[PDB]
């Protein structure tokens, strides 16, 4: 989540005074080239380096990845609601996440670099196979980066993290 190791250079700037979604590129600044769902969406020649996705009211969504002088970074699944990607569903106040890669090994989840869905002492956080259930979703509390990975493997070794922001 907070870390960029594993080629997860694309991050969301959560220092916005206005409800605009800004994406950041953690590469050696020479020129930042942005892509959206594989297609290039911008090329920052010095000066600015953050990419504005617009107002968060517009539900910005897509797989965003950047590129400096090295090869393209891993994508950052942005999903605002105010390669197979993570599946997002909202039902009432319940938010359910679906693992894109569910080979049937034990799937674990982490929310802002914090394990979740493991303890059964949480009625509002249920994990069922490749699906994570988040009941009574708190927009300010349950939003952020989410990541799933299989036992024995590293969360940073995931193909991508999911940035979830939902008003329910």
């Amino acid at each position, epitope marked *: 989540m907070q870390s960029i190791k594993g080629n997860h250079l694309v991050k969301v700037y959560d220092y916005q005074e206005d409800g605009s979604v800004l994406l950041t590129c953690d590469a050696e600044a020479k020129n930042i080239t942005w892509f959206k769902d594989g297609k290039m969406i911008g090329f920052l020649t010095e000066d600015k380096k953050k990419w504005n996705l617009g107002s968060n009211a517009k539900d910005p969504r897509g797989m965003y990845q950047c590129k400096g002088s090295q090869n393209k970074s891993k994508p950052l699944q942005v999903y605002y609601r105010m390669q197979t990607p993570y599946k997002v569903s909202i039902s009432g106040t319940t938010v359910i996440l679906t693992c894109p890669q569910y080979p*049937g*090994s034990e799937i674990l989840w982490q929310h802002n670099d914090k394990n979740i869905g493991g303890d059964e002492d949480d009625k509002n956080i249920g994990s069922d196979e490749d699906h994570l259930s988040l009941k009574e979703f708190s927009e300010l509390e349950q939003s952020g980066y989410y990541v799933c990975y*299989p*036992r*024995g493997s590293k969360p940073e*070794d995931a193909n991508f993290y999911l940035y979830l922001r939902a008003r329910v």
Partner: single-chain antibody
Amino acid sequence: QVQLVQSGGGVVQPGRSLRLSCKASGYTFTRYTMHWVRQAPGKGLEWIGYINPSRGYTNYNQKVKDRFTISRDNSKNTAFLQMDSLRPEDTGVYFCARYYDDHYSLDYWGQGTPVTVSSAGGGGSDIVMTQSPLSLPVTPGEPASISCRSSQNIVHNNGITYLEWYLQKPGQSPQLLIYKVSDRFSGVPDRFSGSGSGTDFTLKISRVEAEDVGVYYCFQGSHIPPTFGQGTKVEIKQVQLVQSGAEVKKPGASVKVSCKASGYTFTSYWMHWVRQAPGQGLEWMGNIWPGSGGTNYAEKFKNRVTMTRDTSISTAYMELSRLRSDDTAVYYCARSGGPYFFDYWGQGTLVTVSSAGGGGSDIQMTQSPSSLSASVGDRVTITCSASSSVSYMNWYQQTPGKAPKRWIYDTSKLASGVPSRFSGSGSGTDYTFTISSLQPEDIATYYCQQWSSNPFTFGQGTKLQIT
């Protein structure tokens, strides 16, 4: 000090079942995954499976997921691995190891429990009724003689020698031929006849025609588990128990093969339920006294088969659960008679089971060299090749007779106590383990391990010796 105590190993007959216990101490047993690893003699470490004690989540290697059962007791901080249908290939040292999710490594390994699969108790529990000739071809009109010898003396305390020689003509229900050692079945012609005592008995088929052609498979009777023989297939040199239909499933699925009963008071004759593994002999699976729903399930299937009764509809089911690759069989559902076990038999519902397999093939690790001899102080380099890219590599040191100890985690991080002379390096599918200065204390077997994907894959192990 974190302590893992393996218990329950020993010698058991092939096919028998064994349950092991791993007591975990020094830590919160629910906080770390407990995985099972077996080291067969001459073989490297094979990951068997794991159980998440907090979640109960279990995974098993495809080789034993249908024969091994991983269990745990949180109140006892102990894990149980139920090993059923024990086979000679499973003889070895079984070790329990703690998964420290933080290091993506098995950090603590228990001292391990040896398991040896061999005929220690074989022939005692069973009664190996081997049959003398085998596939003896007989020309018509000749006095063919097929004998069978019993691993014990089959003479029950009642004194009735309940041998029987049930003859199965091609593609047909087993049909009983000599009721006890020397009677004959009503309607079984006098052409067949038999004699015997003690541990050797035999039947002389004085005149043989086309009809007797088939295999004469000698049952046992006094032996507590009925035990039918290998099968000497002789070749050339009403009350009807209706079965259910041919079904084909995939591994681990469930079959309910039914037997409808007609012509005899269903709750008056125990519907003992044989099985016939193709290319093997018949073996009782478990009875059911349709009167009271009592089952007396057999040992080799004691925890996979459930045979219930429905007296009203005159049908008897036999729910075999968690089918394994070799359960493919024709489950003839016969009626356990008065003076002869397995009197009149059913059609039989062949149930051939063979799934694709799933995780049979996984990441493969190759360690080179397999054996290395070096002088004290020499720099030794060991290479480990994975069939697919792995995020982190683990190195384990195994001294002769001692448990594997994690030596490097995360492909470069040395475990607590590891001398700095040891070093691990690599990424993707190539990793290196380097000892800068060999010391006499370093003689052991070294293995590289991948955990990125289940099942965890270990290299063949490098034997390091001092010249």
